[PDB]
Amino acid sequence: NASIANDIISHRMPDFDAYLRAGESLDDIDEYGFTPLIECAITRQIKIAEQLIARKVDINKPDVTGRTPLHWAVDNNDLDMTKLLLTYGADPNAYTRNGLCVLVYPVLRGQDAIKQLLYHHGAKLDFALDFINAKLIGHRFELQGDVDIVNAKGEFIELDYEGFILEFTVAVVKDSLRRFISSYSTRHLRDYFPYIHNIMDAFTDAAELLQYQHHPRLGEQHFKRIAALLKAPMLILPAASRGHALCFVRYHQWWAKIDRGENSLQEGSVNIYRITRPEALTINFIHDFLYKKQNRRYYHQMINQQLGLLPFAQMPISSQISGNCSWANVQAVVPVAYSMQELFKPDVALSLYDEWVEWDKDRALDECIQRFYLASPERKASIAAILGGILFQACDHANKRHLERAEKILNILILDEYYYVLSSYLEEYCIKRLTRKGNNLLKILDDCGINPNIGVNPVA
């Protein structure tokens, strides 16, 4: 074709004057959904970006998802492009449509240089930390609905507990594993740490392979990278099908499909096959798998025939029929990849999975509790809302661990300045009508030595 986007992708300096005479604006959204500056950021082309900035393009204009050019430069860990953008007015606290600010991914990936560069130009870390913690809590505790967090301007923005973000999920799962094997309370699991390490490695590669999905036109270097990763011992392939993320794991001659949703009613959650035609696992296979649009028939039948997937084993992973199973599908990668490395004993893998999940629940809760006492009034209100959501939705009065979490939470929700949270709940689920969860909340309050003085009593 003939396009400024195709010029940028092909590393050719565009003839900006010819495109302007043709009636185009250098801020226009191109055929790939991006602006010329966002194309420069994606392709790490700093000279073309300098040219565009010289022609006074909107340096903060995002794509439909809300990713500003600074978002794209930072997600690439490109220090020069990030510095160029920040020099000419890129908002360091811009957030995407889901509320994901510029700092989130560098925080999750431990990229200290770009984090300090963003700090120097005004980025606020609390926004990223609160977003990460709220999303992790909504996923781990299976919370429903929304909650309001505080942006870098002290204003409340909505956050969807149920919204699934794939790259965010991969990053947060890798970081959670890193924190898990580094906790004192998990030293008795030291012998299991090497295998986990490998899993983390795979997750890293997965992140890379996912980022290339945003590129408008993959080239020689992307295919060289895919060829390099096809030689890695372990491979994690998340696939999008029917609005859900299902997961595949390759480890040497073994292949594994993880789908805890509707399909698990027919197949079970986790199936492990032997790859009898490894010669079909090529660059073109990975491209069809990750970078072309495929239907359910491709992921549930075509790949079995192409790779010659011989059924070998299965894992009794619990189904997730209600809601969105993408998060659970990504979580289940850890025990499945562990078991595949063991090659067969799902016992240790499932026990490790349960221990990791419960530890991460308690870690996120402790993060919230610790940040409450150091927080501003608005962030305190947000954290109190999150804790009340945890208490009301995820704590059963017959579970002693849930009761310990409820004690932790009620230490904060009983303060006079925040009791209103509990008040609201008891107003909307105990006085107006006695729901099941309102009854459970009354029971929990009584088992912690708390009389709400509301006129309603539990019904055992």
Numbering used by the authors: 0 to 342, 348 to 464
The authors write:
Among the 8 core effectors, AnkH is the only one that is conserved among all bacterial pathogens harboring the Dot/Icm T4SS, including Coxiella burnetii and Rickettsiella grylli. While many L. pneumophila effectors are dispensable for intracellular growth of the pathogen in macrophages, we have previously shown that the AnkH ARD-containing effector is one of very few effectors required for intracellular replication in macrophages and amoebae and for intrapulmonary proliferation in the A/J mouse model. We determined that the host nuclear protein La-related protein 7 (LARP7), which is a component of the 7SK small nuclear ribonucleoprotein (snRNP) complex, interacts with AnkH in the host cell nucleus. We conclude that the AnkH-LARP7 interaction impedes interaction of LARP7 with 7SK snRNP, which would block transcriptional elongation by Pol II, leading to host global transcriptional reprogramming and permissiveness to L. pneumophila.
The crystal structure of AnkH shows that it contains four N-terminal ankyrin repeats, followed by a cysteine protease-like domain and an α-helical C-terminal domain. AnkH is an α/β-fold protein and contains a total of 21 α-helices and seven β-strands. The N-terminal domain contains ankyrin repeats with four helix-turn-helix repeats (α1 to α8, residues 1 to 122). The ARD is followed by a 4-turn-long helix α9 and an extended β-hairpin (β1 to β2, residues 123 to 162) leading to the middle domain. This domain (residues 163 to 361) contains a central 5-stranded antiparallel β-sheet, β3 to β7, and is extended by the presence of helix α12. The C-terminal domain (residues 362 to 461) contains a five-helix bundle and packs tightly together with α9 and the following β-hairpin, forming one domain. The N-terminal and C-terminal domains pack end to end into a crescent shape. The middle domain forms an independent insertion attached to the side of the ARD that typically functions as the protein binding surface. The structure-based sequence identity between the aligned regions of CPLD and XopD is only ∼12%; nevertheless, three β-strands and two α-helices are structurally similar between AnkH and XopD, with His243, Asp258, and Cys324 of AnkH superposed on the catalytic triad of XopD. The orientation of these three side chains in AnkH deviates from the active configuration, and a small rearrangement of the triad side chains has to occur to attain the active state.
